[PDB]
């Protein structure tokens, strides 16, 4: 079902640090998508290896896992229709450079190494994600009071 | 004259639903337009059919109209320069996927046949959709105690 | 019965002014608060003597009708338990300077004067308020659909 | 850094809050206040979990339509930490019953009625113990220093 | 006059160092007060001692001093009706354990020693503070185009 | 600390945004984008300041109207740092005439016409280096460290 696309949404350290947590999770609520996961942790070097693989070979490998260890972490799974590709439109450019105002990288960091936030860039990397992130139980289904009036 | 421009906006069912309606108008108001019409009603069919003539032919239209009149709507008339442009640009794409985030449907739904709000595309149609939900005496001029400071 | 309570909430022409509209109704709508009644007036000299009836001995009464007549406001009708008595605190005390931060006046204006904003005293009074500034065709009857989220 | 300063409270946004989108905005309330996060999760509370949490009133009746009640939704469990979170996380709240709670207060602004009261918070340092220890494991909470914790506390 | 009453607000290094200027100044603003003196500083020992000078034999002075010279601060004047009182109710109790929700330091600050804000307790605190702070031709005067709706 | 991550700009509030209550919600977009404050006075800016200011438009038809306006009220002169503040700093104020101006933005949110377009800011770093100089003794800038400045920088 295309209304049940998910996707998944990390808080940075320093978005955790900067106290945007509740700005974040806002941005979500109010634009009509459905929390399904979430969670408050310190991500281990192992995940972290897992979850950048694909830059294991690259010299800033090592720099980056050490700093997505050296705080908490919030890991969200969000619910709705194509809310992979329009999540990343909330978060605006990787860059926070070229975000625009009005994304959450636009209004509130400046730097790429510290850009708060991260989100899913595809259905494939979410699936891929949401399991390495999540565990199936720890996903919650309910139906939102208001499903109707977001959806046909 | 140019200032004095006007357009007819109106927040859909789903908008009154979700709480939007007090959100809807800060965004006009601190934008620095002028409240002219303000009407909290059910619209009926016949006047939905008539807003709607553009689209009689299509095959969503019963279905449309059907909606509109599900549940209650805030009819609004606005004033200010190009204000029927802007206003436009203020509300977003009217495809929810399309609108920018800073916009009304861009930051607060998602799917196009629940869009939370109407604007006017042209003074043209502006000038109808008023005289259509609007009787003349509902229309109310003043002065803005700030006019000075929004306009040269 | 209790939770289909009713209460007027009126605007004054300070409110318009200084463009409060949209916060106000976003008050009532995030308390979980249902809109009955919406319009944008210029309030008759016959109906605001009819609404201060019990002020029509005091020496103020004939400055204070010209004033509400001095420019346009918003009448409002909003339900839910104890709708008028809440509304009461929402708005905070009638003068600015012994209101709440927290509350609208506390929050938005200074002197009595030009408190923004009016609420029924009693469930008496909003029974005689609302009749007044509302033709019953006016009220619109909905169902939210937070309803069982809100009541029991 | 002072151990009175580390003090633990347990907050619970109830399943209507989750309904009715006001997750972000409270955590914002307790952002913005100073208090630090330790322990936040998405779940449907089990009904033994709710029978052990509302033990004291195990025997009243409706007892039964509150655990029904609050397994019908799932819940954001929330562990927070600073000096006198306990208390002043109450007053940040406002008063159980919403119709005593006053404007500011994350009641007082969001909710109407005592059955739907959208969020809970330990009314005592000892109730805040049982509370953490019995929704949280020990490993699920974070330790971490705010980067503002020097203009927070002296 | 009694509506050109004035007092002197500091922002203290916490709240400047917490990202809460904004948020503060937002607060006098939307509430009807007047800005007329503005400045970032960095608060000399000596000026520093002057304005504690009742507290100079008391045995903390030494490190309220240090602290408030540690970081720069937001000094300002506000004019408006009762703005001494009133402004020290929109602060809150200095002590920010007793201050309400909806409050400047109700919602922002959590310990004494670091309470964000000062606010003068007395017109004539008022009247010294101003005149220590700031110099007679760093105070602005200018009238707002919403006088006449916040003021009878 | 990083020079690169240390350019200042200059941003004006003008006397339309200053009677129309922008001053605070200026202000608190550059702190929740992570730009740090480093000058900030409240001023009527004389007519010297203002023709040395405007220099480059002395001969254009309009320029006593523009001179006489901007002295008409009080205006707000700010400093702010931060990696590339001239250049994110206007696209955080918007297109300068506000007709073309994007939603989100402070003209796009706030404004209407390019008379009356409530804000200036540097329009690059030779004009900032300018601006700062002219409107601000060296004085009246301060220097200090934000305590989130390895959150936002790395």
Redesign the interface.
């Known amino acids: 079902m295309a209304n049940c696309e998910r996707t998944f949404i990390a808080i940075k350290?320093?978005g955790?640090?900067?106290?945007?947590?509740?700005?974040?999770?806002?941005?979500?609520?109010?634009?009509?998508?459905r929390?399904?996961?979430?969670?408050?942790?310190?991500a281990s070097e192992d995940l972290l290896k897992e979850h950048y693989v694909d830059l294991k070979d690259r010299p800033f490998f090592a720099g980056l896992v050490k700093?997505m260890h050296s705080?908490?972490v919030?890991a969200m799974v969000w619910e709705?229709?194509?809310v992979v590709?329009?999540g990343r439109?909330?978060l605006?450019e990787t860059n926070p450079?070229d975000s625009?105002?009005?994304?959450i990288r636009?209004?509130?960091?400046?730097?790429v190494?510290?850009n708060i936030i991260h989100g899913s860039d595809s259905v494939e990397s979410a699936e891929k994600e949401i399991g390495l992130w999540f565990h199936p139980e720890?996903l919650?289904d309910?139906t939102?009071?208001?499903q109707?009036?977001?959806?046909?």
């Not at 929390?35 to 310190?42: H, P, R």
């Not at 109707?148 to 046909?152: H, Q």
Request: proline share 5%; aromatic share 12%; glycine share 16%.
């Open positions: 350290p320093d955790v640090q900067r106290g945007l947590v509740g700005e974040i999770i806002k941005r979500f609520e109010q634009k009509g998508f929390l399904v996961g979430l969670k408050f942790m310190q700093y705080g908490p919030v709705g229709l194509n590709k329009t439109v909330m605006g450079a625009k105002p009005g994304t636009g209004d509130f960091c400046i730097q190494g510290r720890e919650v309910y939102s009071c208001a109707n009036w977001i959806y046909e």
